[PDB]
RNA sequence: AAGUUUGAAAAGCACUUUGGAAAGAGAGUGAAAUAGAACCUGAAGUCGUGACAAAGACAAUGGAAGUACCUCCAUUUCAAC
RNA sequence: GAUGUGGCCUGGAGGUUAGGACGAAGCUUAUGGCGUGAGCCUAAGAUGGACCGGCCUCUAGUGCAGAUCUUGGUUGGCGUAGCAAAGAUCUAACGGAGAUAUACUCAACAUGCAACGUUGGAUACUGGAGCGGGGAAGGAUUUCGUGCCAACGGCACUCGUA
RNA sequence: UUAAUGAGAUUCCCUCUGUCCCGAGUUACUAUCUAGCGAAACGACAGUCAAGGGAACGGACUUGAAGGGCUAAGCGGGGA
RNA sequence: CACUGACAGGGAACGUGAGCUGGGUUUAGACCGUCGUGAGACAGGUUGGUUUUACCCUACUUAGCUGGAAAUUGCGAGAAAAAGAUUAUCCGUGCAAAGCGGAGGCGAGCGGUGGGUAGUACAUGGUACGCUCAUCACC
């Protein structure tokens, strides 16, 4: 069901979530950089997101947004603070967490393995511009998948 | 500078300290494009060179016809941008190393490797001076390449002429050069001629009929 | 076959970009003669503000000669520098090298914070392991070679002086790591050089031993910055009429059609300001004491008047002036509180202005704020007399 | 802050160690100053003496040229959970040439700001009385100044603030005080 | 425009678990849920991800000859052969 | 430009020979072999699920890279341009899943942000040629109550002419 | 030829002024940075120059000279 | 006409319109003269007559991050360095001289950091200095 395999599979927890009505571009960049952090080192993350004390790195989904010097951590000069896509890792990490506790494994050791998101099939609206033109206006959701294991 | 981890290694192989097969050749009464073409050959065979004293290689004419060639040269520049323009070496050995790439070809690889393979001096620095004997090219030699009526120049003053500002400095260092060289020189004569009187009485002791064998090959 | 103009802006002063670091640093140092006295050829100095001064001319044939005239002066505040190290240079045929460094065996604080972000939250190592090696015998050894060395190739010497934060007592200078900077030792032989410098070690350096009150000085520092600016500020092109399409502050054609790429001689909008300048032929107008050995500061010989360097109200956005200061003429690169290099001229001082000794008659220091008419706050006291505030203060005195 | 001065990683003991070190050698090189400019000050001439100016601290109205002020100041301890104290903000330093339609959400905003930086709390609540203040002259008619009553009070342990005006007839003369 | 063309039967996923829900993780049905509902097959193009190859700036692609490394490929040989 | 080819290829027909649930067609390929080539054939599918290959002859809507080609889908530009007329919201309480959402250390700040509907209060606007109250034309349930937030209301919603 | 009338065309004078000498300072809304949302045009392949030839003005070709990679804001020389 | 030292001549797609401007030229309206039977014409006069798009590449201007000498690799070793049991087996000086001067442990030396005390110096809160006890190192 997943484009990967755990180690182990006794010893991890998958959670996926599909059409999530998030940017895939910004879902794209807020997943990637959990990719082989701990669980509990991710949750953080993504609290001080939230917080804006740090951000998300944007890497190949950065045409002409803004620098920051919270870039740096990452290597990077340009970052942002997508609250939407955070808040939707945020709670397929919960849904990870969970599948690892009825497994009878500790969350605070999981460390998140793999990391996967991709564009979803979009959805249509439309705009309208000048000399009587009806132009388009998609949705560009995604879906994304993970699996996390005990270290 | 070598790296941290060069000299740790070197240190568990527990090799010794090695140097490359480097040929020195001193520049001084060379001609400049006979020198240049020559050196530029033997690179192209895998030959690692070191050229000193460029700022005494000669080119054939008045001082004031190779300025002015040096001058037209020094006028080409991107108008638009004169950074990224000809960058033009004001420096003799920098010079030479241009007068050798332009006999290379410098946009391969290989032409790269070359050219970095030559290593250019004005004077000879200290750390060539007791690398071993330095060579000549006889082929790109001024008195065997120029008749001696004719006018030429030397590079260093057409250099200084137009630009290098380290004509006094190489004239100092050199003449400290020589003068070192020199008195290490008039010393050990004591022990070059025990060895020649060492050699002479050899004749004497050796057996004889060895002695007639370095007669017939002309050794005795 | 146009209408002719020169172009805008120097060609020279290129690439108008930020400057690589905020201080003044002299690029070249005054041509060495060995003829003259050892001596030093820099100081670091911080600018305070500015006010102007009254003094007679001396410069005959002119139509002011022996007439007064009132000239806009710089204040900029100079403590001792201290020096804290030997450097020496050998020459080479790719330029100059430095032969070592000759520590002090002693540093301030404030010398060692500048090699640290977060002084107080740090070890503090910064020399311990320099200290407890230069103090012993193989320590002593390095020092004498280095010195030798220095003796035997060096034909550069300079010291490394650093400046006193702490004595510089400025509240809206933040900074609290002293500043660095290269000395150049001119004068004398190569040895002479290095036994002036071995005395200066560990000690304290006054801007009144390396210059002289009548003299000219250059001036290192970097300007006042103003970010990304326009080309009629940047360059001074002319504005486009009212009239235009899409915009009047700009240059209406960047280029012809070949080449087929823009010049880099064409006004562009970019950074203004923050650039390093060097700006020769200053004139030291005054070297004053600190007000805590001379408060009469102000004083001349024809105004007898008791009075501070400071203007009432003190120099805006800076504060009081504490310390030893230089009186420049005129005006230099850079706002208020920025450190700045002091150098000896390197341009030849021989025309009548620049010989010219001063001496000054006048010293304004009235208000900065707003139109000051009051030289000291006598002069107001006397004008106003007494005020309700303080005959409230005379009132709860009485009780 | 550095890993050597992390608190996680020291612990308490170690900390508290590293810290009293410091505080000790600053303490040793002021006793050692202190007294050595006390001697020397006492064996000087008078006119050297008064050419001296303030040094051994001998000035009025001067800071201790021995250490730092705040090194001075005497820790209290914990400040309880439930605290009040009584405040002037200059709302007009804050407010200065922002756009007319702005000036009373922006003081709102500075007002929570403020108090949230002296009490340690995100949740800062403006009580009835304090908003009709800052807006009773209209969004462009802030008053300059103005003295809020600051109440912190807990409900891990969550901590608020509850801000409400104090009128007062005069600004001049108020300092920030503790109130019960 | 648009084949409902899931599967032989709807057997159309009880029940547990976390989530507000959508759903996820399990468990079941089924020969097969990469047969889970406008569901047979499921191409190209484009994209994600893991492993690897490397790689300056010669736009990239391409030709010809080698070489280094790989090779879920083919074929041959393996003793008086 | 002409012509030849027991020359290649595709959908059907008359013949003749085979194959297929022990897996047909289709589809995938660092999957080899054969052919100068068009192509053919094998292997492997950790693909598929029911038809179909060879050979002779017959037959045709029989071979694509381009026609500002037709239809469908995708795509870089791009998280870019921008979503700037009509002045504007603030505060508490309540409601709500929409929070005060945390591994160890950790008192609270520095690790759950941002946004909602209602009521009260504050502030402002429309300014009677009105974002007032009623009619024609046109529209036709958009009216009302309760509920609900998948899609729609180019931001949001607990709200709605949905 | 014509008084009166004219968003008709023209010249001069008084007044007046940033039209200009010659520019400077301030505001609102943008641009800019953030959250949410999110297009189009255009798109052979691609993009550093000099000269030379060449369909007689090259990004590709010949010979030289440059060129470390990736980015944010602008800008209108070129992309005939 | 006037100032000036002087008011030289040219090229850059008759440089430069996604830089402007649009007076001229060059559509449609309209008037005149001449021509034409006429519709209409004029190389003649007159008046009125939409100036669109950059967010891509390069260029240029500023503004960030960052590898890299085998220009990412080889382990592929070249110092504008020293001068020796083949850089090992001491330090200074001197010409790459002649010589010349220092160089199991305890204790000692030399110092770095802390106590006591004593002037002084420096711009005067903060460092250095003499004596003694402590520790630390290296020898
Ligand atoms: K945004
Ligand atoms: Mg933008
Ligand atoms: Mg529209
Ligand atoms: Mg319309
Ligand atoms: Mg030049
Ligand atoms: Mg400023
Ligand atoms: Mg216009
Ligand atoms: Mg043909
Ligand atoms: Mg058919
Ligand atoms: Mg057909
Ligand atoms: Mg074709
Ligand atoms: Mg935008
Ligand atoms: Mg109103
Ligand atoms: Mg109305
Ligand atoms: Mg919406
Ligand atoms: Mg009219
Ligand atoms: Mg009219
Ligand atoms: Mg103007
Ligand atoms: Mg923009
Ligand atoms: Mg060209
Ligand atoms: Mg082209
Ligand atoms: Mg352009
Ligand atoms: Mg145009
Ligand atoms: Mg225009
Ligand atoms: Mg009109
Ligand atoms: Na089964
Ligand atoms: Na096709
Ligand atoms: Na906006
Ligand atoms: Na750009
Ligand atoms: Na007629």
């Known amino acids: 069901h997943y484009s990967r395999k755990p180690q182990v599979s006794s010893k991890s927890a998958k959670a996926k979530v599909s059409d999530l009505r998030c940017h895939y571009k910004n879902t794209f960049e807020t997943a990637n950089v959990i990719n082989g952090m701990p669980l509990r080192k991710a949750q953080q993350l993504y609290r001080q997101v939230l917080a804006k004390t740090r951000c998300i790195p944007f890497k190949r989904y950065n045409g002409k947004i803004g620098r920051t010097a919270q870039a740096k951590e990452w290597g990077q000069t340009k970052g942002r603070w997508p609250r939407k896509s955070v808040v939707a890792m945020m709670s397929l990490l919960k849904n990870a967490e969970a599948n690892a506790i009825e497994k009878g494994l500790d969350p605070n050791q999981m460390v998140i393995k793999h990391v996967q998101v991709d564009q979803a099939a979009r959805m249509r609206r439309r705009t309208y511009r000048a000399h009587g033109r009806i132009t388009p206006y998609m949705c560009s959701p995604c879906h994304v998948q993970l699996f996390m294991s005990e270290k | 500078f070598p790296s941290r981890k060069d000299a740790f290694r070197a240190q568990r192989k527990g090799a010794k300290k090695h140097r490359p097969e480097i040929i020195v050749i001193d520049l001084k009464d060379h001609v400049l494009g006979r020198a240049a073409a020559v050196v530029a050959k033997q690179l192209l065979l895998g030959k690692k060179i070191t050229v000193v004293r460029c700022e005494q290689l000669n080119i054939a004419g008045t001082e004031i016809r190779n300025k002015i060639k040096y001058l037209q040269y020094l006028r080409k520049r991107k108008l638009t941008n004169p950074t990224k323009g000809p960058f033009h070496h004001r420096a003799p050995s920098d010079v030479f190393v241009r007068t050798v790439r332009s006999m290379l070809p410098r946009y391969t690889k290989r032409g790269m490797k070359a050219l970095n393979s030559l290593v250019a001096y004005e004077g000879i620095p200290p750390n060539v001076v007791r690398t071993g004997g330095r060579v000549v090219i006889p082929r790109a030699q001024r008195h065997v390449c120029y008749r001696s009526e004719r006018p030429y120049t030397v590079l260093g003053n057409m250099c200084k002429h137009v630009g290098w500002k380290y004509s006094d400095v190489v004239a100092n260092l050199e003449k400290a050069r020589v003068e070192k060289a020199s008195r290490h020189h008039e010393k050990q004569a004591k022990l070059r001629d025990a060895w020649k009187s060492a050699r002479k009485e050899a004749l004497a002791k050796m057996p004889k009929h060895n002695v007639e064998v370095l007669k017939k090959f002309g050794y005795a | ?399 | 802050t550095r890993a050597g001065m992390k608190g996680k990683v020291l612990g308490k003991e170690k900390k508290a160690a590293i810290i009293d070190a410091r505080k000790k050698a600053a303490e040793s090189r002021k006793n050692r100053d202190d007294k050595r400019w006390k001697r020397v000050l006492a064996n000087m001439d008078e006119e050297k003496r008064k050419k001296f100016h303030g040094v051994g601290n001998t000035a009025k109205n001067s800071r201790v040229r021995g250490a730092t002020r705040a090194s001075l100041l005497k820790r209290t301890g914990r400040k309880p959970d439930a605290v009040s104290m009584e405040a002037t903000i200059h709302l007009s330093k804050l407010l200065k040439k922002k756009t007319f339609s702005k000036r009373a959400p922006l003081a709102i905003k500075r007002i929570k700001a403020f108090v949230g930086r002296l009490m340690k709390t995100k949740d800062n609540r403006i009580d009835a009385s304090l908003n009709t203040y800052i807006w009773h002259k209209g969004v462009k008619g802030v008053p300059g100044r103005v003295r809020v009553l600051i109440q912190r009070k807990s409900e891990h342990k969550h901590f608020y603030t509850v801000i409400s005006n104090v009128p007062v007839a005069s600004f001049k003369g108020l300092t920030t005080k503790t109130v019960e």
């Open chain 3, 1 to 399: 076959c146009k209408f002719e103009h020169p172009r805008h802006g120097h060609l020279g002063f290129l690439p108008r970009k930020r400057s690589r670091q905020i201080r003044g640093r002299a690029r070249a140092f005054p041509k060495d003669d060995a003829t003259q006295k050892p001596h030093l050829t820099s100081f670091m100095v911080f600018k305070a503000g500015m006010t102007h001064i009254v003094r007679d001319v001396d410069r005959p044939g002119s139509k002011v000669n022996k007439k007064e005239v009132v000239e806009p002066v710089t204040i900029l505040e100079a403590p001792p520098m201290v020096i804290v190290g030997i450097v020496g240079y050998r020459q080479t045929p790719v330029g100059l090298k430095t032969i070592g460094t000759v520590w002090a065996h002693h540093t301030s604080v404030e010398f060692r914070r500048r090699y640290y972000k977060n002084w107080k939250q740090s070890a503090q190592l910064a020399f311990s392991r320099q200290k407890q090696f230069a103090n012993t015998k193989e320590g002593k050894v390095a020092e004498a070679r280095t010195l030798n060395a220095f003796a035997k190739k060096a034909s550069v010497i300079r010291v490394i002086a650093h400046t006193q934060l702490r004595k510089l007592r400025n509240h809206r200078v933040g900074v609290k790591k002293a500043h660095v900077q290269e000395i150049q030792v001119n004068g004398g032989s190569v040895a002479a050089k290095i036994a002036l410098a071995k005395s200066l070690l560990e000690k304290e350096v006054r801007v009144d031993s390396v210059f002289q009150q009548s003299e000219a000085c250059d001036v290192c520092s970097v300007t006042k910055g103003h970010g990304t600016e326009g080309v009629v500020k940047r360059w001074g092109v002319a504005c486009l009429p009212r009239k235009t399409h899409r915009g009047l502050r700009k240059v209406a054609c960047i280029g012809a059609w070949h080449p087929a790429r823009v010049m880099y001689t064409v006004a562009r909008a970019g950074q203004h300001g923050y650039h390093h300048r060097t700006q020769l032929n200053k004139k030291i107008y005054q070297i004053g004491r600190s007000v805590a050995v001379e408060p009469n500061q102000a004083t001349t010989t024809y105004d007898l008047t008791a009075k501070t360097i400071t203007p009432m109200g003190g120099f805006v956005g800076y504060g009081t002036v504490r310390n030893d200061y230089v009186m420049l003429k005129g005006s230099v690169s850079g706002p208020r509180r920025r450190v700045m290099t002091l150098r000896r001229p390197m341009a030849p001082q021989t025309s009548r202005q620049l010989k010219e000794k001063i001496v000054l008659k006048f010293i304004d220091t009235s208000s900065k704020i707003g139109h000051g008419r009051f030289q000291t706050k006598k002069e107001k006291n006397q004008w106003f007399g007494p005020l309700k505030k303080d005959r409230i203060r005379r009132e709860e005195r009485l009780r």
